C-alpha cells in the first residue's frame, strides 16, 4: 500500500482519525456510522495489500528467482490477478468517495453520507458475476494451494530459503502464504457483518437505509452463489474419485 492511504487509515477509528474539534461538531449517531464505514475501508485497504503481497512479493519473486514450472506457481496463487483487479477498483471507489467528502484545508476531516449506491454497483451486474465466478474458482483451489505449498516447502531447499527470506520482515509476521490464502477466502464473509452494522446506524436518511438494505441482500445472494459453486479440488484426484 501507499503511505498516503496508510497514514489516512492508521488510527483505530474515525473518531481518532479526524481532528477532535471537527469531531465535536457531530451527533453521536453520525460518529458511530462513520466508525464502521472507516473500518470497511480500512479493511478493504488491508485486503488489497494482502493480494499485492501475493502477486508482487511471492508470485513474481518465485517466477524470477526459482526454476519452477509456471503452472506450479499458478496452483499456489490461483486467480490472484483477477482478485487484485476487482478489489483494487472497489477500493479506488471507496477512497474517492472519501476524498470528495473532505473539508477544504484538511486531508483528514470528512463525513460520508452516501455509501449504499456504491455497494449496490459493486455487488450487482457484471461486477457481481465476475466476483462470484472468481471466488467460486479461488475457494475450490484453496486446499490444493495449501498442499502444494507444503509439498514444495518439505522437498525443496531453495524454495524453503526463498520463503524464510521474504517472510523474515516484522511486517510480514501474519502474512505468510497460507495466511494470505485464508485471509482472502474469509474476506467475502466479512462484508455482511460490516454492512449490517453500518445499516444499524444509518436510519436518519431513509433512502440510505434502503440502499444499505438492498446492498446487504445482494451480498448474501453472492455468498450463497459462491458457497454452491465450491467443489474442492485435490492434487492428483483420479477420474473415479470425482464421480462418486
Amino acid at each position: 500500500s501507499m503511505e498516503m492511504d496508510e497514514k489516512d487509515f492508521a488510527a483505530d477509528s474515525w473518531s481518532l482519525a479526524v481532528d477532535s474539534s471537527f469531531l465535536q461538531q457531530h451527533k453521536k449517531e453520525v460518529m458511530k456510522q462513520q466508525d464502521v464505514i472507516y473500518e470497511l475501508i480500512q479493511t478493504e485497504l488491508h485486503h488489497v495489500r494482502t493480494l499485492k503481497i501475493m502477486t508482487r512479493l511471492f508470485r513474481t519473486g518465485m517466477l524470477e528467482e526459482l526454476h519452477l514450472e509456471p503452472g506450479v506457481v499458478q496452483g499456489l496463487f490461483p486467480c490472484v490477478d483477477e482478485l487484485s483487479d476487482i478489489h483494487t477498483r472497489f477500493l479506488s471507489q471507496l477512497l474517492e468517495r472519501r476524498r470528495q467528502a473532505l473539508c477544504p484545508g484538511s486531508t483528514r476531516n470528512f463525513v460520508i453520507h452516501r455509501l449504499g449506491d456504491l455497494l449496490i454497483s459493486q455487488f450487482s451486474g457484471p461486477s457481481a458475476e465476475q466476483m462470484c465466478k472468481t471466488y467460486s474458482e479461488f475457494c475450490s483451489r484453496h486446499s490444493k494451494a495449501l498442499k502444494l505449498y507444503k509439498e514444495l516447502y518439505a522437498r525443496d531447499k531453495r524454495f524453503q530459503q526463498f520463503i524464510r527470506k521474504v517472510t523474515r520482515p516484522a511486517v510480514l509476521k501474519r502474512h505468510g502464504v497460507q495466511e494470505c490464502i485464508l485471509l482472502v477466502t474469509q474476506r467475502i464473509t466479512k462484508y455482511p457483518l460490516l454492512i449490517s452494522r453500518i445499516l444499524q446506524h444509518s436510519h436518519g436518511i431513509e433512502e440510505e437505509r434502503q440502499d444499505l438494505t438492498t446492498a446487504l441482500g445482494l451480498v448474501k445472494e453472492l455468498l450463497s452463489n459462491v458457497d454452491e459453486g465450491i467443489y474442492q479440488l485435490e492434487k492428483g484426484a483420479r477420474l473415479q474419485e470425482i464421480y462418486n
Binding site: 473500518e39 486446499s143 509476521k173 501474519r174 485464508l182 485471509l183 466479512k190 455468498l223 458457497d227
Partner: protein, 178 residues
Amino acid sequence: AIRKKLVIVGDGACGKTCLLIVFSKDQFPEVYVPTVFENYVADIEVDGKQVELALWDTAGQEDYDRLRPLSYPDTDVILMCFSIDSPDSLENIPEKWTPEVKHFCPNVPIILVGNKKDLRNDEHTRRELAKMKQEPVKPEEGRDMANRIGAFGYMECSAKTKDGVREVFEMATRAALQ
C-alpha cells in the same frame, strides 16, 4: 519458536470476535470495538516454551457450509465458544458444532469456553432470560457439556473485563503442544 494454529468456532454472538480482539490488542478498546477480526500471530511463552500462535475466527462463516470448512486445515487447537447469557447457544454445541469439528479436525483438542461471564450477575440479563423461562448458564452445565463432548477442558472468561482471557490462550497453547 514453533508455530501453532488456533481457530475459534461457535454461534453468531458467542463473543468470539470480541475475545480474539481483546487478547490480540495490547491497548484495550475504549473508543471503538472493531466489527471484524482478520488474523493475528501471538508470541506466547507457556511453561518455558516459546510459541507463535496464529489466531482465526469463523465469524460470518456460520451459514456457509462449504466456505466455513476452509478455515480448518492444519488447526492444532479449537476453542469452542458459547455465550453464558444464551442457553440456546449451548444447546447447539453437541448437535451441530462438535460433529463438524470432529469430522474436519480429528484428534484436535477442543477447549469449551463460556464467554461473557460478567453477565451472570447482570440485572437486565436475568430479567430478559426470565421472560423466556431461562437462566444464565451455570458453571456445572458448562463443565457437564464439556465432559459430554470429550473436550480437553472447560474454561470461562469475560472479554468486557479481560478476566480469564490470558489463561484461555495460554491453556490452548499447552493443548496445542500435546
